[PDB]
Copies of this chain bind each other. A is one copy, B any other.
C-alpha cells in the first residue's frame, strides 16, 4: 500500500517526488534525485550524484549510478531522462562533471537485462540496448539506435542515429547513422531501410540515403572524397546531413 516500501532504505540526502514508488530491499543512496511517476523495483541499488527523471522504471538487481574508474573527490554525475525502462541487472556508471563528460541518458530508451553503460557514455532518445550490450566508456549512442543482444562497443565509439547492430557485434570503430553492422569484428552490411520506413521517411529521402551508402562504401572513394560528394545531397535532405555529419565526426574511422 505505502509507495515507499518500509523495507527499502532511503538516504536522508535523496530527493524524491511525492509519488515515487520504491520496492522492498532497494537502496536509494545519498545524492540520488528521483522524479514524478518513477517506479523503482525491489533489490535495486541506486548511488549518486544521480538524477533520474519522470516515469522511469528500474527493475531488480540493477546497480545505477556506480563509480567512474583525474583527482580524488572530483565531482561525477549520472543523469537519466524520462520514460526509460532499465531492466534487471543493468549496470550504469557515473561520469566526470568538470570536462563535460557526465554519463547521460535521454528519454524513451529501453536498456535490457544485464546491459552495461560505461562511464562518460551519452545515450540519446528512443534507443534500444538489448540484453548484455556493453558500452566500455565514452560511447555516444544517437537517437533510435538499436544494439542487438551482446553487442560490445569499444571506448570512444560513436553509434549513429537509426543505426543497428546484429547480435554479438564487436564494434571497434564508429557506426555511421542508419548503417547496419554485424560480426566480430563488426562490418558494415547495409542501411536500416526498415527503420526509415517505420519512422515515415519519404521515398525520396530513402533513395538519397541508398545512394549515400554507395558513395561511402561501394565506389572505392576515400572518406574525404565521399564527404565532398555528399555535400549537395546533405544540403537538400536533412536525413542525408545526419549521415554526412556522422562520417565527418568519426574519430576512430568508420566501420567497414
Chain B residue nearest in CB terms to A61: B61
Interface membership of chain A positions 42-55, coded 1 if the CB is closer than 8 angstroms to chain B and 0 otherwise: 11010000000000
Asked whether A215 is an interface residue with its Cβ less than 8 Å from the other chain, the reply is no
Chain B's nearest CB lies how many Å from the CB of A58?
13
Asked whether A146 is an interface residue with its Cβ less than 8 Å from the other chain, the reply is no
Asked whether A238 is an interface residue with its Cβ less than 8 Å from the other chain, the reply is no
Which of B45, B91, B136 contacts A167, CB < 8 Å? B136
Chain B's nearest CB lies how many Å from the CB of A176?
21
Kindly list chain B residues whose C-beta atoms are within 8 Å of the C-beta of A183. Answer: 184-185
Interface membership of chain A positions 106-140, coded 1 if the CB is closer than 8 angstroms to chain B and 0 otherwise: 00000001101000000000000001101010000
Contact B149 A167 (CB under 8 A): no
Kindly list chain B residues whose C-beta atoms are within 8 Å of the C-beta of A60. Answer: 45, 63
Kindly list chain B residues whose C-beta atoms are within 8 Å of the C-beta of A61. Answer: 43, 61, 63, 89
A154-B134 in contact given A24-B9, A61-B89 (Cβ < 8 Å) = no
Asked whether A168 is an interface residue with its Cβ less than 8 Å from the other chain, the reply is yes
A136-B154 in contact given A114-B114, A168-B184, A184-B183 (Cβ < 8 Å) = no
A167-B170 in contact given A45-B60, A88-B63, A114-B114 (Cβ < 8 Å) = yes
Kindly list chain B residues whose C-beta atoms are within 8 Å of the C-beta of A170. Answer: 167-168
Asked whether A150 is an interface residue with its Cβ less than 8 Å from the other chain, the reply is yes
Which of B9, B89, B167, B184 contacts A89, CB < 8 Å? B89
Asked whether A25 is an interface residue with its Cβ less than 8 Å from the other chain, the reply is yes
Which of B43, B59, B149 contacts A134, CB < 8 Å? B149
Contact A168 B152 (CB under 8 A): yes
A27 CA to B24 CA, complexed, in Å: 10
Kindly list chain B residues whose C-beta atoms are within 8 Å of the C-beta of A63. Answer: 59-61, 88, 113
Chain B's nearest CB lies how many Å from the CB of A44?
10
Chain B residue nearest in CB terms to A182: B185
The 3 closest A-B pairs by CB, nearest first: A168-B170, A152-B167, A63-B88
**Can you show 22 pairs from A to B with CB atoms below 8 A apart?**
A9-B24, A27-B42, A42-B45, A43-B43, A43-B61, A45-B60, A60-B63, A61-B89, A63-B88, A63-B113, A66-B88, A89-B91, A89-B114, A91-B113, A91-B131, A114-B114, A116-B149, A132-B132, A132-B134, A168-B184, A183-B185, A184-B184
